[PDB]
Structure formats: structure tokens, C-alpha cells
């Protein structure tokens, strides 16, 4: 049984204060507790350029399919030369049209954020249409593919609101079979990416989750389970001027002051 949404109304102008205060650079987060209810909204409902973090939701849909018979683990996945991305990724580097199992391909599109097994797994699926249907229907409300991966333009849409809720659905058991769930929390804790989110938390704390970074846009999303027994959900995503550094120090900073205050608390 889930509590009650709680604001902690201090902290949220906390944190409202420190992203208002940054010239050019437009910031939208959310976080939940799972024992107090106490969360953060600062601008978490609106729509930002996904990035890379859409392969999170696309991870959700493939164990859905293996769940329902409808892909399986080791079937062979065909590297097409349509479906080549550059960018991230080791894929890229091997033959055209040469092979990989399933799940190999989805643990590259987590773990390296792999572009070409990204384009891989949509196509399997039943390509981006049917990928966006299964979001709505999960309540992600602006969650969208609309263009192959790495999207450099940044076209495909969500919010930090959408890929926190989702985490907490899989967190709570829903969605996928107990087995997909703890493959997916597997692989999301074994991300090389680890500069943003997690590099704001205490010794011992453990998270899964994804990162995305197109220049213009960096953000992270997941799970955190604090050494005192508690566990909360995180998302936040930070438009910028191309690579400004400054955009990765608010995500840590944020983490930071999110972190300590649940210690506190
Ligand atoms: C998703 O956003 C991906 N981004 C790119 O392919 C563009 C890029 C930008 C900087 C360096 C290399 C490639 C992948 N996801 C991000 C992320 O997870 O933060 C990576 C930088 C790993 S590439």
C-alpha cells in the first residue's frame, strides 16, 4: 500500500530558487518517497526532449513481449543496415546484417546506450506507433517516439513526471512478471553512465536507472534504496546551451539535496 503524496513544500522552493537562478537553462524534476509520500515537482508535468532516456520505457515494452510470448530471449535480432545508428554504441563497429540475441541487444541499448540495438528492439516491437500506444496505456501521457535513435534533434518527447511513475509501477510489481522485473533492475544498475543522479547520493545507496544526453538536453531517471530502508523514485532533465557543464552540476546538486533531506527525515 502506497502513502499519500506529500509535498515538502521547503525543500521544493529550495530547489525552485537554485534552477530559477541559471540563466539559459530550463529545468524539470520529480521525485517521490515510497514509505513518507514526501515529493518534489518543480516543473515535472512539462514535456522535454527525451534524449537517451526513452530506452527505459522501450526496456519495459520488450519484457512485456518476452512476458507475453511474443519475443524471446535468444531468438537472433538482424543489425540491418537501416537500423545502424551512429553515435553510441558498439553494434556499430560489427557487419551489416550480421546477428544477436534479443536480450544481448536490449542489455546494450541499456547499459552503453546503444543506438543501433535501441532502432533494433523498436523495430522488433512493432516500431514506434505501437511502442506509443503501450506508453498511453501505462499513463505515460507525454511519452513519444517519433524519430529512430540517437535523435540528435531531440524530437522524442517526455517528462520527468512519466518516467519516475513508470519506475514506481515496475518498483511496486506492475507491469511486468516478478522474473522480467528483476532482469530490467539488473541491467539498469549496470549503466557505465553514473555521472549525474547517483553521484549525488551517500555511501552504500544503490540505484537503477538511465541517463540521456543530446548536448541541448541532459537528464536521468530511476530508482534509489538509502541504507536506512527507505526508497524513493528520481527524474530530472535539464535543457542547456550545447554541453554546458553547468547542466550536469545541477542534476548532482539537486540529487544531493534530495538525498540528504530523506536522511534527515
Ligand atoms: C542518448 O541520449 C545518447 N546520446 C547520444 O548518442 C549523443 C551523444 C552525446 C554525447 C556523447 C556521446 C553521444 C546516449 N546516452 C547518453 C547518456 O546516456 O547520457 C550517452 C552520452 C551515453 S550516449
Known sequence: TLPPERPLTNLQQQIQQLVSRQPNLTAGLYFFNLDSGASLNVGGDQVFPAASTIKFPILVAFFKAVDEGRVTLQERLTM???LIAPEAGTLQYQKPNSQYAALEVAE????????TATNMIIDRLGGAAELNQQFQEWGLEN???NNPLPD??????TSPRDLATLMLKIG?????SPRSRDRLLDIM???????LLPAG????ATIAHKTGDIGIVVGDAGMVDMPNGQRYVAAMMVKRPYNDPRGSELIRQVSRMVYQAFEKL
Open 172 to 176: 511496486q510489481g506492475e507491469i511486468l
Open 152 to 157: 540528435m534533434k531531440g524530437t522524442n518527447t
Open 189 to 195: 544498475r549496470r549503466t557505465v553512465t553514473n555521472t
Open 143 to 145: 511519452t513519444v517516439i
Open 80 to 82: 540491418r543496415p537501416d
Open 201 to 204: 547520493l551517500g555511501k552504500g
Open 108 to 115: 546494450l541499448m541499456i547499459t552503453i546506450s546503444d543506438n
